[PDB]
């Protein structure tokens, strides 16, 4: 035996148990909870390192020999912040723990066997998280997909048919033919994709036809008419077909108030966009639904974190998103907002308390697709600076806050949309949708994206260079992004009904086609680290939000982290 200094050990292999790492330039400190490695047997790749024929690469490997192994990765997940080797086999996460050669090392399971068929990826000093899941995507342009992918999002659930006005306003892919258009266009992109149908219809036959055509859920948007009849019918059909329903409630209170909307929902699972109201007529009372069990609340990028400039852009974003001409007196008079800095500030505190469970974009319709993760971590850092460490922290670290805010965009949307069996976390059996970050750039710029067990996007330098590092370095598509490899790497999510009817062969899709499941029997209690159901007393006379009596508010941030240190523009 021998003892080496912890500084040298960490430089060689990355942080181990009890070591703390700052996340980005924020104030959040993540502590390694436990380590699967055996000291002195660490896997290293290089000139004279251990990952060599006969030393750590087995010459008699198990039949579960890995296709790819990520060595010494700091896994940051809702299941824990720990250190391990991630084994990937056949596009899934084959195992998490100590990998290597059973012939020359101890404590190596059969599912983590490194052999001659194994590629090596050095994760030492690198954080591995699950790919982001953005569930509010307005499919306005296909250029959103590479932007989100470079930001670290690997799954996009949304709706749209291009830059139509219906898509500019709503997250809706209406009808069987438009669903076929979008599903066949999806073959191009390196991103897991799911499409939502139009729920604004009192026709059970039409709603069922959309679900059987391939939508994974319904979107009931105010711009297509959010009426109690439509809500009721969409929820009935969705309970029949086991698909999620998302709602963007009525801003004008035309047919009723928040109480009438909640009565129409009638205690059935519903995923709410802009649970803070986003200036709608249901605000600020719609925040009350964030305390109900059956409501999965999501908040959009632009209002988090609350900053000095947050309120200035809201009216322009609202008018352009809702398609109201700024040169028309009638449209300008119609564009009435109930937004308040009190509500905008309360949104961040509700996120910190776990009242809001999902963070999303609403891309290019009051929201930025490539800033979901960045704004989530900006909110986490701002709340850490304001209120200090959470009372749930069991140590001198921010692990609980890290896990809560990471669940906000990784596992909670996966559970909400019924894809948590496949994606959302770094767990054995899930698809290998992994993001490699360096801790200095965590939350803003990933090192690389592993899509379905193969590298799909990566920071790359000059192609003519003698090494991959020299400038200019930017995000380039890798081999999993090209040819027929993307068909194996990517997943299109459909409903179970469409999957059974054989949507893949009928539409000639080459991507993996997977059915969503367990969308109806989930409540707020099923969200990870964000299951706080509290009676939210909203005084609309004073626009005051109280949870368990205590008032909630936050001060605007004059300067956020992960914003100007990392981006030229």
């Amino acid at each position: 035996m021998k003892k080496i200094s912890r500084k040298e050990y960490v430089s060689m292999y990355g942080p181990t148990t009890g070591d703390k790492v700052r996340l980005g330039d924020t104030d959040l400190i993540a502590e390694v909870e436990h380590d699967y490695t055996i000291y002195g047997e660490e896997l290293k790749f290089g000139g004279g390192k251990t990952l060599r024929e006969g030393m750590s690469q087995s010459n008699n490997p198990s039949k579960e020999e890995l296709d790819l192994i990520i060595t010494n990765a700091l896994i940051v997940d809702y299941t824990g912040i720990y250190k391990a080797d991630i084994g990937i086999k056949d596009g899934k996460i084959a195992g998490i723990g100590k990998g290597g050669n059973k012939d020359m090392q101890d404590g190596v399971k059969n599912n983590l066997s490194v052999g001659p068929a194994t590629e090596a990826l050095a994760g030492e000093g690198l954080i591995v998280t699950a790919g982001g899941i953005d569930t509010h995507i307005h499919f306005i342009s296909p250029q959103q997909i590479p932007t989100a992918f470079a930001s670290g999002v690997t799954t996009m659930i949304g709706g749209g048919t291009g830059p139509a006005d219906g898509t500019n306003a709503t997250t809706i892919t209406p009808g069987r033919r438009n669903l076929k258009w979008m599903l066949r266009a999806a073959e191009e992109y390196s991103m897991n994709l799911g499409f939502l149908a139009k729920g604004n219809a009192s026709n059970d036959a039409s709603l069922a036809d959309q679900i059987e055509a391939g939508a994974i859920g319904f979107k009931i948007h105010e711009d297509w008419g959010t009426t109690p009849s439509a809500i009721n019918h969409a929820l009935d059909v969705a309970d029949k077909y086991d698909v999620q329903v998302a709602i963007h409630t009525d801003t004008l209170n035309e047919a009723g108030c928040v109480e009438d909307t909640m009565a129409a929902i009638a205690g059935r699972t519903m995923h709410t966009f802009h649970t803070e109201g986003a200036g709608g007529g249901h605000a600020p009372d719609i925040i009350k639904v964030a305390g109900e069990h059956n409501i999965l609340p999501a908040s959009t990028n632009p209002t988090i974190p609350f900053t000095v400039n947050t309120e200035a852009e809201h009216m322009d974003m609202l008018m352009v998103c809702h398609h109201l001409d700024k040169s028309i007196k009638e449209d300008v008079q119609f564009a009435d907002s109930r937004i308040r800095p009190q509500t905008i500030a309360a949104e961040d505190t509700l996120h910190d308390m776990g009242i809001f469970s999902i963070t999303s974009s609403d891309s290019q319709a009051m929201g930025r697709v490539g800033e979901v993760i960045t704004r989530t971590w900006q909110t986490a850092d701002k709340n850490k600076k304001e209120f200090g460490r959470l009372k749930e922290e069991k140590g001198d670290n921010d692990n609980f806050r890290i896990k809560r805010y990471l669940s906000k965009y990784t596992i909670n949307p996966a559970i909400a949309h019924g894809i948590s069996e496949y994606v959302g976390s770094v767990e054995v059996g899930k698809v290998a949708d992994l993001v490699l970050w360096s801790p200095a750039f965590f939350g803003v710029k990933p090192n690389m994206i592993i899509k379905g067990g193969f590298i799909a996007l990566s920071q790359m330098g000059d192609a003519n260079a003698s090494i991959p590092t020299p400038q200019p370095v930017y995000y380039r598509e890798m081999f999993a992004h090209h040819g027929k490899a993307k068909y194996d790497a990517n997943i299109t999510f459909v409903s179970q009904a469409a999957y059974d009817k054989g949507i893949k062969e009928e539409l000639g899709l080459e991507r993996q086609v997977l059915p969503v499941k367990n969308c109806r029997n989930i409540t707020k209690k099923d969200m990870q680290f964000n299951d706080t159901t509290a009676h939210i007393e909203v005084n609309p006379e004073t626009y005051h939000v109280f949870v368990d009596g205590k008032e909630v508010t936050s001060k605007p941030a004059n300067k956020v982290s992960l914003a100007q240190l990392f981006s030229i523009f």
């Binding site: 932007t147 974190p305 995000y475």
Partner: protein, 238 residues
């Protein structure tokens, strides 16, 4: 220096703005593309400098180009320039409205309208109804909403308004402020007069027989001003 596609696009936009600025210094009158690029690049640079707020940038964007610095028609063509700029407190959308004053010489795509008013809903007689908003929030009703089924916090004679909608320009809305009482004009719904959706008070053909069922439903669900007889006779389907 890991560069995102957004950053590459913004770099292209910045150098288009630089080219526009160089041409303006040379004295060339800017065209539409050059003017838009110049304003956008200037806003981005100011935001990066970080001494100004988004409101200050919105004000400042309107002072960059004089009417004599652009070709004829550019000011008419440019209505607003939006640009997402990275401030010290994150990315914010700066919108500059009418950055250049119109000279009026040439208006591309200008309309030459007749001086005759458009008569909408011709041949439809409008009735007047007084509506009070007894709720605590304003209520906006669209031109084609079935007025019988509006927010139950609105108080009016619903029997008078069964089968009717607002007599306003389609796509516009009427706002009732809380406590405020307004008089609105209502016209019969056209076409097949089949009301479906809304508050599910009718969900069938709108006639006198469905009127009684709708009124009973509205009274049961607490819609203000809906008067149904105490001794209501049910039908086989309702």
């Amino acid at each position: 220096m890991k560069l995102t596609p957004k950053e590459l696009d913004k770099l292209m936009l910045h150098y288009a703005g630089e080219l526009a600025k160089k041409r303006k210094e040379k004295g060339i009158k800017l065209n539409y593309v050059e003017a838009v690029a110049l304003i956008s690049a200037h806003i981005m640079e100011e935001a990066r400098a970080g001494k100004k707020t988004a409101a200050e940038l919105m004000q400042e964007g309107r002072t960059l180009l004089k009417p004599d610095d652009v070709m004829d028609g550019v000011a008419s063509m440019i209505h607003e320039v939006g640009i997402e700029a990275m401030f010290p407190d994150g990315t914010k959308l700066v919108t500059v409205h009418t950055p250049i004053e119109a000279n009026g010489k040439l208006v591309p795509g200008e309309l030459f309208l007749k001086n005759e008013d458009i008569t909408i809903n011709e041949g439809k007689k409008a009735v007047s109804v007084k509506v009070k908003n007894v709720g605590d929030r304003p209520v906006q009703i669209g031109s084609h909403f079935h007025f019988f089924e509006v927010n139950r916090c609105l108080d009016f004679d619903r029997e008078k308004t069964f089968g009717k909608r607002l007599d306003i320009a389609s796509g516009t809305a009427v706002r009732f402020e809380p406590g405020e009482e307004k008089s609105v004009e209502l016209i019969d719904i056209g076409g097949n007069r089949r009301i479906f959706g809304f508050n599910a008070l009718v969900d069938r053909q709108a006639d006198n027989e469905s009127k009684k069922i709708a009124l009973h439903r509205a009274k049961e669900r607490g819609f203000h001003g809906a008067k149904s007889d105490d001794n209501y006779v049910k039908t086989i389907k309702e």
